[PDB]
Amino acid sequence: HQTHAYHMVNPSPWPLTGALSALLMTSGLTMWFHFNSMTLLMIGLTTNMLTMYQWWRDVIRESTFQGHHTPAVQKGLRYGMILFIISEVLFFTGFFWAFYHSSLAPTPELGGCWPPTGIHPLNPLEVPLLNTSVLLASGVSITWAHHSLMEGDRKHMLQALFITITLGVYFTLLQASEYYEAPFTISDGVYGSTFFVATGFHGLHVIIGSTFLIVCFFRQLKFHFTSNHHFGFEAAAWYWHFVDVVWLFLYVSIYWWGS
Amino acid sequence: STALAKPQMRGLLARRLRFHIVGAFMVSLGFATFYKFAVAEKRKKAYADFYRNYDSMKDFEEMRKAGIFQSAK
Amino acid sequence: KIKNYQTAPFDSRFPNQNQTRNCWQNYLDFHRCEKAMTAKGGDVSVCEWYRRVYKSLCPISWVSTWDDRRAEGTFPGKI
Amino acid sequence: ITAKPAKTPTSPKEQAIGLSVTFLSFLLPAGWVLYHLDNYKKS
Amino acid sequence: SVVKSEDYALPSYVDRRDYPLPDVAHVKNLSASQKALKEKEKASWSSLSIDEKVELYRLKFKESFAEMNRSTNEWKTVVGAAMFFIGFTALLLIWEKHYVYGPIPHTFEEEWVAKQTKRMLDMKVAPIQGFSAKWDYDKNEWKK
Amino acid sequence: FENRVAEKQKLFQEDNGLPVHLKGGATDNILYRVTMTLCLGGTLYSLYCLGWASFPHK
Amino acid sequence: APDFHDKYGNAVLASGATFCVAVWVYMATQIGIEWNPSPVGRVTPKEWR
Amino acid sequence: HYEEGPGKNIPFSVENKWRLLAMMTLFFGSGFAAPFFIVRHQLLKK
Amino acid sequence: ASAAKGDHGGTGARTWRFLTFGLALPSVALCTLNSWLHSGHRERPAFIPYHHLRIRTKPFSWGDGNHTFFHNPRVNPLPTGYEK
Amino acid sequence: ASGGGVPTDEEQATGLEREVMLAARKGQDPYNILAPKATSGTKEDPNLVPSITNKRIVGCICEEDNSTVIWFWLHKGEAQRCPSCGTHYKLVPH
Amino acid sequence: MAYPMQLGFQDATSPIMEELLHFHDHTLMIVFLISSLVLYIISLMLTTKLTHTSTMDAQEVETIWTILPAIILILIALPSLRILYMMDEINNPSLTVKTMGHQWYWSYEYTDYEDLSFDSYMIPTSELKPGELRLLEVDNRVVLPMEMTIRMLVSSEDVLHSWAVPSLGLKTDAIPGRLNQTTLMSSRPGLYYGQCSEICGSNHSFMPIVLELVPLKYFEKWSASML
Amino acid sequence: HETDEEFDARWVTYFNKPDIDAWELRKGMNTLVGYDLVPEPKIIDAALRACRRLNDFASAVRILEVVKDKAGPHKEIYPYVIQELRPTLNELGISTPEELGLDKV
Amino acid sequence: MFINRWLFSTNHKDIGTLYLLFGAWAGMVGTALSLLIRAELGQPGTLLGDDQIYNVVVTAHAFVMIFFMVMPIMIGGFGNWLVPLMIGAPDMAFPRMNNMSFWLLPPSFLLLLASSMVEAGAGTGWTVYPPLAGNLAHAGASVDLTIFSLHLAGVSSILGAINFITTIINMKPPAMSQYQTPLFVWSVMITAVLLLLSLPVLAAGITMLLTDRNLNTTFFDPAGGGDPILYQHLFWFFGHPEVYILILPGFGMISHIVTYYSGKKEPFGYMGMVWAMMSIGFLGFIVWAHHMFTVGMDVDTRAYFTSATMIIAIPTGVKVFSWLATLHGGNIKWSPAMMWALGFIFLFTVGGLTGIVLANSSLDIVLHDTYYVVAHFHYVLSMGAVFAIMGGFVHWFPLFSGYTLNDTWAKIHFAIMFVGVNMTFFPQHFLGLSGMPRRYSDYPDAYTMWNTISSMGSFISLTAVMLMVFIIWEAFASKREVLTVDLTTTNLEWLNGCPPPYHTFEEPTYVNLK
Ligand SMILES: CCCCCCCCCCCCCCCCCC(=O)OCC(COC(=O)CCCCCCCCCCCCCCCCC)OC(=O)CCCCCCCCCCCCCCCCC
Ligand code: HEA
Ligand SMILES: CCCCC/C=C\C/C=C/C/C=C\C/C=C\CCCC(=O)O[C@H](COC(=O)CCCCCCCCCCCCCCCCC)COP(=O)(O)OCCN
Ligand SMILES: CCCCCC/C=C\CCCCCCCCCC(=O)O[C@H](COC(=O)CCCCCCCCCCCCCCC)COP(=O)(O)OC[C@@H](O)CO
Ligand SMILES: CCCCCCCCCCO[C@@H]1O[C@H](CO)[C@@H](O[C@H]2O[C@H](CO)[C@@H](O)[C@H](O)[C@H]2O)[C@H](O)[C@H]1O
Ligand code: CUA
Ligand SMILES: [Cu+2]
Ligand SMILES: [Mg+2]
Ligand code: NA
Ligand code: NA
Ligand SMILES: [Zn+2]
């Protein structure tokens, strides 16, 4: 028997299934891009979802059900999440770098101007402003959710978290609509390239963040969270704030300053 | 017989170090010049001596007559 | 005036290794000048300098591509 | 470090075998490929 | 004497010139005569014989300083074997030259090199120090 | 909803030697088998795809 | 008791050195390797044009 | 639990030195051989 | 800045709910209204076959290889112009 | 405006998390979350090292801010001393 | 060009290359000083039976280990940056020449007056004339006036290449959509060789550069004849 | 940082403690040989008498060996130290490593 | 049981062992590729008769040595084995995610090998610059498989970096501050911070290349207003921290080895060593454009990158002189690991000094993309990393295995390797100074002599590698079991015996605060 507070994890198949899912998704994208076929990719996506589901299921089992999350284990997970978020910030930094590189020194092929000749940018005061109010509002409602949880208030936690998720969905649907309405495309030179890749990765993170919030919502429904122990919720909240802040930088840089 | 005299017994390592670091330095400063005198100054003099009375047109003429050029027969 | 033209002179607007914009600017200047002069029924030959400079600096393929695109109506610079 | 005498001693003869087998495992396949390089081009 | 794997956590014996007095005696268990010797050691050491003094030393320690610090002939084996394998490498290089490599380009033929050498001198390759500087253009020969 | 955490705590703390990924019961075993079969089968298929793609169809 | 090095050290050293020198000298000089050394003081320049 | 101790904390057997030799030969040998066979493969493609 | 609001006595759930319903959601409602007026079709841009736009270096891995993923017939011309 | 429905740690914490929580309430540290405070470390006043077995590794930071830690097995029986500073440690099993 | 068994730089063809040679001598002297000092000290540490294994105080000696290297770096940086800024000074060229990299050959454009352009390909080994250099000769050399400041403009019409002539101290990457500028001035007539210096595919090894430096009058007649 | 004399006096006092135990004897010698010095005869004398109070002849011989070892290539140091210690060696009946043949490889 | 233990591991030792096996196998692949390189160059003319294949071999050589040999061995192998033991931790913070970092690597390696088997391979250089790496000059799957291989390796190391940072910050004894952790632990921490920040930038860059190749983006394509030079910035923004990533755990092991075989309880100037690694890690983020001195950058930018790059010599010098000061007064044990460490110190110094030569942008104009750069990094990186790895391997082999190596054989191996690597790489300085470009399958005739010698050298190192395998076989064949190890008081990783039990520190160490 151990006399430290750390978690020795049962031998697990999910790292291997996760790694194999990565092989399948990447070889699958290769197959899709070059050999006109989607089979490998679909299998990879499926095994990836299965891996994530069972892995995080087990983390819930280990914590809520088995009590392995001592304060020391929880503290480790805090560092882990913070460090993951930092890595995601640097990933976006590479796309912001690409945006500023292209837009600050527009080449002659673009007309030597930004936005390029033939590009008609979206009005940042229209749906992009709406998007901004939506994610900012969702940062307020998620903070309400956190305080309700800490104060032991089940109903208001659920209501605030539901509002936050609804806003996440609203942003996602607004963005999908704006993608369809946009008169420029990903193939419209470096303007389209930077716009859609940067906002597209952001949109993906909004979807991931929303999903994580939905997971917390159902765990809350099932009474998993105590008023003091709820790291899955914290963290979905940190990740959500991260997604808000990335949006603000996108809005200021690409939509506003780059228009 | 006679007794043996008392030798130095303390800081033998530090005393060895003190002695040899000066030698480590003196190689360097003594050497410094070897690359300097034998390579660097030699090079400066070679370039100076080469160009002092260098006649580029004469050099060209010799090259031209040797048949090396596409543009000059 | 400045005939005896040897090559494009140093231009303090473009003092660095990347000379792309120098070529570009002079190309634009020449064709803008030609258009302005023709609009006013004037002497195009006052524009000659910009032509000499861009001819000196610009790769032949760039000039050729730009000329094709002006004729096509797809030149992205303002003239 | 100190250690026990070998539980299963590897004699000079056994070492020669292990060494030779090891060297051949690297040399023979690569040697085969390199020897036949001209055959791969002329095919 | 006999050190066991399962004893790893216990203070152990070592012979090390920078740790002269190790944590345990070399020999822990004592025979009847060895016990009597340790008793004798409690009286004046002048009454101990040289043999008894050596035996007491050998109970406490394994090797002496002179023993543990002795030089060896290992360098001969190391340097000799290294040279053997470096020599073996040349056999692989001979094999490679014979069986893998074909002819090198015609430009290395003696007459080519002579003509190319003249052309390099004609174009004054490295005329300050490197190449043509070593040719005497007046005497039509390599400088001495 | 009723708070049933205590029931889950009892189930997952049962002294049955099962690893956490199978401790929910028979459904864990099925889902595990489906996942590993898709991964291993998919990996074999990726290798086949590599073999196919490694050779020209001029 | 004499160890491996006491018994065989001298022989390993002598044979190793002799073998190494011989095979490298042979490889370097006898199998047609073209080292392409400097022409300086070696090659007589020849009319090319 | 698992076997612990020398020769037991590894995914390969060292119970027989000759079987081990064969396995290490195949293991390091396959890695060393692979680039030569990749080159051969590419040359044979045209 | 202190915004212009000014609450602080204890940062609790009640305050954050007050902000959610009193500031955050009303801002969304306002922006939603604002968008619901500047909606409607902005005229489609006249087609010019600019070489820096409608890039095709490799066919897309869907459809006929020539349509972008969220292709909108109304406003996204192909390299050859707007669809018939 | 505000009801309950969220369980507390007191009600719902289980397994090792609960043990740590209950022991902390008693001012006890069976899972080694806290650094023990040193005694004077004499033979009369040795540092008391709890263990669930008959030996435990001690690390001794001989002087404040030493970067070097001195490590050794402390065995059941008479007090042992740090081989660097000589401060005394004694195993108290359990 | 390089010659067999060469150890150092090709002889300088331009004053800037001469500067680089002396600066390299200076730096390599320092490099030799440090590497030998380290080797000497290491051997010293390892050649005594005398021991001292108790804690050693670090701060006094670390001052020396930081300050002296800092001083040495300044002694390298000072002449290093002098040459950098001299390389960059305004010099007023008499001529502009463009070069475009291609897979796998160089083209040259001299368009100050007339439209002169041509391609420059490696002479295949089987076609070398007696005495010519394997992998280095081209069919059409870059003829240029000696003793004159020339502006070279470098770009590419496909992948990256890099236009280099070591004996002039030149290497300028050739990047599509970009026009990189360098200056060229030869103190001497002759033939000066270089090789593509950015990996550009399967014939990267086989697209060399040959400059032919001759008097202006010869350059002018060659230019005219190349139209 | 204290004189040579104060350093030596401290060490003399260390080994002179009447009821010095085996652990303290080992700790002392093992610490002392870490320093950049060969210990003065008076330190060694005190350490040898501690060996006597601890009824440990072998450690006395070992202490003499480590004196020789700490001197390194300075071959004059050990014969001098032995010289200075001879009355103590004679008084306590301590044989040197050489007299015991323990200097043989 | 086999599958549970070796495929489903949550144990830092076993996962460490997996990484060491993977890295060793990769080392054989990378070595074979290096020999093919030197075979092509071993005489003038063409050996392979296919320079696309040559370029593919060069490219794969680099990726294999960096991503599959060095990083897995140092961080995955020694990091996993040693870090938890050195801080008395029962395992890594995330022992299951740790296992995925490992298992991502065989698929990553499979993608790289697939890239080389399909079409004509990725003959791009390990830099993968567009437009050469674009969909016109490299049409088809090869470059995309290379990008995906890098994605997987990237994810593996990013998650590993999160694991190491968390473990090192969170899982020390409560009394142990960060200034009481051994230098190797520091070196892994700092390396992990560099990975965490740098790899996502690379991921962004290669993703943009992937979309240029497949989704008609034009990040790097001037036709759409893109810029090939943007890719270079993104790549080298990762790529310089990466070279420090490759050496840092090496500095850490070197500090332990030198301390140990000097018979010291501690390295000289511990806080200076910590300071030096952190300074190097920091400065490593602000120098990347020294890889781009010939792309056409402004003069002031060149002056800045020259100056910032040279400054790194200062903290690096502190480490070199502190190793020397660690040796000073040591009871020197001439073990094979000590020889590797001593070889490391001198070869690293040589390569670092040629780095200082290259930092000078004016000189780099003439040296960029020549064999002088190849010589620089095979000293500082290739020899530095390999010698630190071999030192660490010989030193800790008895800990990991419970068996001893034959020290004489190991000394013979070091000797052959030392001769081989210097014969191979030293003459490449002359080739670079005299103007021979890198990434060439053939050279003007003047360069023959040094290329011939260099290729002969490469065969000497081949003999050493073959011998290394035999030596490991001989250890496992003979089964000499470890008894006692010296200096356990200052080398905690040995204190649980050899090999340590599956579970160590189930009861944590006792450390009081005083
Ligand atoms: C391998 C073939 C060598 C061929 C040498 C040709 C002989 C010179 C011609 C005889 C002279 C004939 C006249 C021709 C002069 C041309 C000089 C010139 O125009 O141009 C300048 C030259 C000048 O350089 C030389 O002059 C080469 C000398 C080598 C430096 C010392 C290294 C040790 C010797 C090398 C052999 C061992 C190889 C193992 C490598 C060891 C790693 C350094 O080119 C360089 O810049 C070389 C680049 C080296 C930079 C790395 C720093 C190395 C530091 C190590 C110090 C080790 C301490 C020794 C102690 C060493 C003990 C370990
Ligand atoms: C282990 C990996 C490693 C390390 C540690 C380094 C260390 C350094 N490197 Fe290197 N380098 C690479 C691996 C590494 N390098 C690789 C792989 C490439 C090319 C990649 C490619 O193109 O494929 C490269 C390329 C590279 C270039 C680009 C050259 C070009 O492509 O044109 C430059 C230029 O500045 C550079 C400089 C430096 C410097 C200044 C250091 C310094 O950190 C070194 C500092 C150390 C010392 C200086 C020695 C010790 C110090 C003393 C004894 C103190 C006293 C000394 C002085 C006062 C000078 N390196
Ligand atoms: C509502 C916003 C949410 C986005 C959800 C939409 C689906 C795409 C997936 C999102 C992931 C984002 C990044 C992938 C890059 C491209 C997609 C960018 C977002 C997007 O969806 O852009 C669309 C194009 O999508 C396209 O090409 C479709 C191409 C789809 C395949 C993507 C290729 C896979 C890329 C590999 C990712 C690498 C990940 C690296 C991980 C780092 C490891 C360290 C825009 O449509 P359009 O018709 O051109 O213009 C509008 C005209 N009316
Ligand atoms: C189109 C979509 C396809 C892309 C695939 C991605 C899909 C979406 C994934 C959404 C993320 C869901 C994560 C759910 C994790 C649930 C498990 C959990 O939250 O576990 C918690 C621990 O936190 C923890 O591990 C924290 C674990 C944090 C996980 C981090 C989540 C981010 C993952 C992003 C992955 C891809 C991003 C990169 C894309 C480029 C458990 O501890 P507590 O909550 O304190 O409970 C204990 C109390 O009950 C005791 O009283
Ligand atoms: C960079 C890596 C360096 C590798 C160095 C390799 C050193 C040599 C190892 C021996 O390799 C063998 O050599 C034989 C020739 O000596 C080949 O037989 C070939 O030649 C024989 C004689 O001509 C015939 O009997 C065989 O059929 C024919 O396969 C054989 O295939 C090959 O395995
Ligand atoms: Cu063109 Cu390399
Ligand atoms: Cu760098
Ligand atoms: Mg380059
Ligand atoms: Na909280
Ligand atoms: Na070749
Ligand atoms: Zn202590």
Altogether, the residues listed in chain I come to a count of: 84
Domain range for E52 is 1-144
Tell me if residue M242 is catalytic. Answer: yes
Helix axes M299-311, M336-359, angle to 10 degrees: 160
Report the candidate in M36, A14, E139 with the shortest Cα–Cα distance to residue F36: A14
- Ligand 1, atom 56, residue with closest C-alpha: K35
Q: What is the rounded distance in angstroms from the CA atom of residue I18 to the CA atom of residue M457?
A: 76
Q: What is the rounded distance in angstroms from the CA atom of residue M159 to the CA atom of residue A84?
A: 8
Domain range for G46 is 1-49
Give the right CATH number for F1-58 from 3.40.1170.60, 3.30.70.3340, 4.10.91.10, 3.20.20.70: 4.10.91.10
K198 is in an annotated binding site: yes
Q: How far is E6 from chain J (nearest CA, A)?
A: 13
Q: From chain K, pick out residues whose CB is under 8 angstroms from the CB of B44.
A: 22
Contact K44 B69 (CB under 8 A): no
Q: What is the rounded distance in angstroms from the CA atom of residue C57 to the CA atom of residue M412?
A: 62
Task: Find the CATH number of the domain harbouring B53.
Answer: 4.10.93.10
Asked if A99 and A256 touch (Cβ cutoff 8 Å), the reply is no
Residue ranges matching CATH 2.60.40.420 in chain K: 92-227
Residue spans per domain, chain A: 1-68, 69-259
Q: What is the rounded distance in angstroms from the CA atom of residue F57 to the CA atom of residue M118?
A: 12
Specify burial of residue E96 (Cβ count, 10 A radius: 0-12, 13-18, 19+): buried
Domain A69-259 classified CATH 3.40.50.2300?
Answer: no
Tell me if residue M12 is catalytic. Answer: no
Establish if M422 touches chain K: CB-CB under 8 angstroms.
no
Contact M141 F53 (CB under 8 A): yes
Contact C21 A112 (CB under 8 A): yes
Instruction: Identify the three-state secondary structure at position K108.
Output: strand
Is the preceding omega at residue A115 within 30 degrees of 0, hence cis?
A: yes
Spatial neighbors of M315 by CB under 8 A, at least 6 apart, are M275, M276, M277, M279, M280, M283
User: What is the token pair recorded at L102?
Assistant: 């323990």
Tell me if residue M151 is catalytic. Answer: no
The secondary element (H helix, E strand) that includes residue A14 is helix A14-34
Contact K41 M365 (CB under 8 A): no
Tell me if residue M231 is catalytic. Answer: no
Q: Helix H segments across chain K?
A: 15-45, 59-88, 216-225
Domain count across chain L: 1
Asked whether D27 lines ligand 5 (CB < 6 A), one says yes
Residue type, M75: I
Chains B and K touch, contact meaning at least 3 pairs of CB atoms under 8 angstroms apart: yes
The secondary element (H helix, E strand) that includes residue K211 is strand K208-214
User: What is the token pair recorded at K74?
Assistant: 């300044």
Residue type, M411: K
Query: Residue M510 gets which letter from DSSP?
Result: B
Tell me if residue M319 is catalytic. Answer: yes
Q: How was this structure determined?
A: X-ray
| Structural class in CATH, domain I1-84 | few secondary structures
Q: What is the rounded distance in angstroms from the CA atom of residue C54 to the CA atom of residue C48?
A: 10
Task: Give the number of the ligand closest to the Cα of residue M290.
Answer: 2
The angle formed by the CA atoms of residues M95, M101 and M106, to the nearest 5 degrees, is 135
Task: Find where tokens 């020194």 sit.
Answer: A105
Contact A116 M225 (CB under 8 A): yes
Residue ranges matching CATH 1.10.287.90 in chain K: 2-91
Task: Name the pairing type of β-strands K208-214 and E135-136.
Answer: unpaired
Which residues partner with K99 through β-bridges? Answer: K108, K154
Query: Which CATH code is given to the segment(s) H1-46?
Result: 4.10.49.10
- Ligand 1, atom 20, residue with closest C-alpha: K8
Task: Name the pairing type of β-strands K190-195 and K208-214.
Answer: antiparallel
For ligand 3, the distance from its centroid to the CA atom of residue F38, given in whole angstroms, is: 26
The secondary element (H helix, E strand) that includes residue A27 is helix A14-34
Report the candidate in M256, M251, M225, M241 with the shortest Cα–Cα distance to residue M82: M256
Q: What is the rounded distance in angstroms from the CA atom of residue E123 to the CA atom of residue E100?
A: 37
Asked whether M431 lines ligand 1 (CB < 6 A), one says no
Altogether, the residues listed in chain G come to a count of: 49
Q: What is the rounded distance in angstroms from the CA atom of residue K97 to the CA atom of residue C7?
A: 10
Asked whether A186 lines ligand 3 (CB < 6 A), one says yes
Report the topology of domain K2-91: Helix Hairpins (1.10.287)
Tell me if residue M291 is catalytic. Answer: yes
Minimum-distance CB partner of D33 among H21, H26, H40: H40
Give the up-direction half-sphere exposure of residue A166: CA atoms within 13 A in the CB hemisphere. Answer: 10
Domain count across chain B: 1
Rg of chain K taking only CA atoms, in angstroms: 24
Q: What is the rounded distance in angstroms from the CA atom of residue K190 to the CA atom of residue K170?
A: 16
Q: What is the rounded distance in angstroms from the CA atom of residue B41 to the CA atom of residue B22?
A: 26
If one residue of I44, I56, I58, I69 were mutated to test the ligand 3 pocket, choosing by the most ligand atoms within 8 A of its CB, it would be I69
User: What is the token pair recorded at A171?
Assistant: 């942003």
Chain breaks in chain G (C to N over 2.5 A) after: none
Contact M234 A98 (CB under 8 A): yes
Which residues are near ligand 4 (CB < 6 Å)? A 52, 56, 59-60, 63-64, 69, 77, 81, 207-208, 211-212, 215, 224-226, 229-232, 235; J 12
Chains F and D touch, contact meaning at least 3 pairs of CB atoms under 8 angstroms apart: no
Q: From chain B, pick out residues whose CB is under 8 angstroms from the CB of E127.
A: 50
Asked if M108 and M22 touch (Cβ cutoff 8 Å), the reply is no
The CATH H-level superfamily of D1-43 is: Cytochrome c oxidase, subunit 8 (4.10.81.10)
Resolution of this model in Å is: 2.0
Domain range for L43 is 1-105
Task: Find where tokens 């023959």 sit.
Answer: M448
Asked if M336 and M317 touch (Cβ cutoff 8 Å), the reply is no
Q: Residues of J marked as binding for Zn(2+)?
A: 60, 62, 82, 85
The sign of the torsion formed by the CA atoms of A250, A253, A256, A258 equals negative
Residue type, E23: D
Active-site option among M12, M138, M172, M240: M240
User: What is the token pair recorded at A23?
Assistant: 């092989």
Contact E87 G19 (CB under 8 A): yes
3-state helix, strand, coil in chain J (%, to 5): 15, 30, 55
Give the right CATH number for A1-68 from 1.10.287.70, 3.40.50.720, 1.10.10.10, 1.10.3720.10: 1.10.287.70
Cα distances (angstroms) measured from residue A135 to each of A168, A200, K173: 7, 16, 46
Q: What is the rounded distance in angstroms from the CA atom of residue K18 to the CA atom of residue K11?
A: 8
Instruction: Identify the three-state secondary structure at position K194.
Output: strand
Establish if M45 touches chain G: CB-CB under 8 angstroms.
no
Q: How far is I51 from chain M (nearest CA, A)?
A: 7
Is the preceding omega at residue M499 within 30 degrees of 0, hence cis?
A: yes
Is the preceding omega at residue K145 within 30 degrees of 0, hence cis?
A: no
Q: What is the rounded distance in angstroms from the CA atom of residue E28 to the CA atom of residue E24?
A: 8
Q: How far is J19 from chain I (nearest CA, A)?
A: 31
Specify burial of residue M29 (Cβ count, 10 A radius: 0-12, 13-18, 19+): buried
Asked if I16 and A156 touch (Cβ cutoff 8 Å), the reply is no
For ligand 6, the distance from its centroid to the CA atom of residue K196, given in whole angstroms, is: 4
Task: Give the number of the ligand closest to the Cα of residue A45.
Answer: 4
Q: From chain M, pick out residues whose CB is under 8 angstroms from the CB of B17.
A: 328
Asked whether M203 lines ligand 3 (CB < 6 A), one says yes
Q: From chain D, pick out residues whose CB is under 8 angstroms from the CB of E3.
A: 2
Establish if M488 touches chain J: CB-CB under 8 angstroms.
yes
Specify burial of residue J47 (Cβ count, 10 A radius: 0-12, 13-18, 19+): buried
For ligand 11, the distance from its centroid to the CA atom of residue G13, given in whole angstroms, is: 49
- Ligand 3 atom, smallest distance to I69 CA: 48
Report the candidate in H23, E8, H9, D9 with the shortest Cα–Cα distance to residue M480: D9
Per DSSP, the residues of M239-253 read HHHHHHHHHHHHHHH
Domain count across chain E: 1
Q: From chain D, pick out residues whose CB is under 8 angstroms from the CB of H44.
A: 40, 43
Chains H and L touch, contact meaning at least 3 pairs of CB atoms under 8 angstroms apart: no
Asked if E105 and M44 touch (Cβ cutoff 8 Å), the reply is yes
Instruction: Identify the three-state secondary structure at position J91.
Output: strand
Report the topology of domain K92-227: Immunoglobulin-like (2.60.40)
Asked whether E95 lines ligand 5 (CB < 6 A), one says yes
Cα distances (angstroms) measured from residue A101 to each of A39, A248, A258, M227: 38, 19, 12, 9
Using CA atoms in the order M422, M428, M430, M434, what is the torsion angle rounded to 10 degrees? 180
M395 is in an annotated binding site: no
Domain count across chain C: 1
Specify burial of residue C23 (Cβ count, 10 A radius: 0-12, 13-18, 19+): buried
From the centroid of its chain, how far is CA M400?
21
Contact D35 E96 (CB under 8 A): no
In chain M, the domains with their CATH numbers are 2-514 (1.20.210.10)
Residues of F engaging A, defined by a Cβ cutoff of 8 Å: 1, 3-5, 8-9, 11-13, 19-21, 23-24, 31-32, 34-36, 38-43, 45-46, 49-50, 53
Report the candidate in M192, M190, M205 with the shortest Cα–Cα distance to residue A93: M205
